[PDB]
Structure 1
Amino acid sequence: DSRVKAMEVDEKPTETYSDVGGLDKQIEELVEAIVLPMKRADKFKDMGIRAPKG
Structure 2
Amino acid sequence: DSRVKAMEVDEKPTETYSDVGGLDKQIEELVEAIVLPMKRADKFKDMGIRAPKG
RMSD of Structure 2 on Structure 1 (CA): 0.7
**CA–CA distance in structure 2, aligned partners of residues 25 and 14 of structure 1:** 21
Which segments of structure 1 move beyond 6 Å, counting only runs of 4 or more? Answer: none
> What is the CA deviation profile of residues 1-54 of structure 1, one whole-angstrom value per residue up to 9, with x for unaligned ones?
001000011011121111211111000001001001000111111000011100
Distance 1:49 1:21 in 2: 33
Structure 2 stretches of 5 or more lacking a match?
A: none
* Structure with more helix by fraction: 2
The size of the alignment, in residue pairs, is 54
Partner residue, 2:52 = 52
Structure 1 unaligned residues grouped into runs of 5+: none
TM-score scaled by structure 2?
0.93
What TM-score, normalized to structure 1?
Answer: 0.93
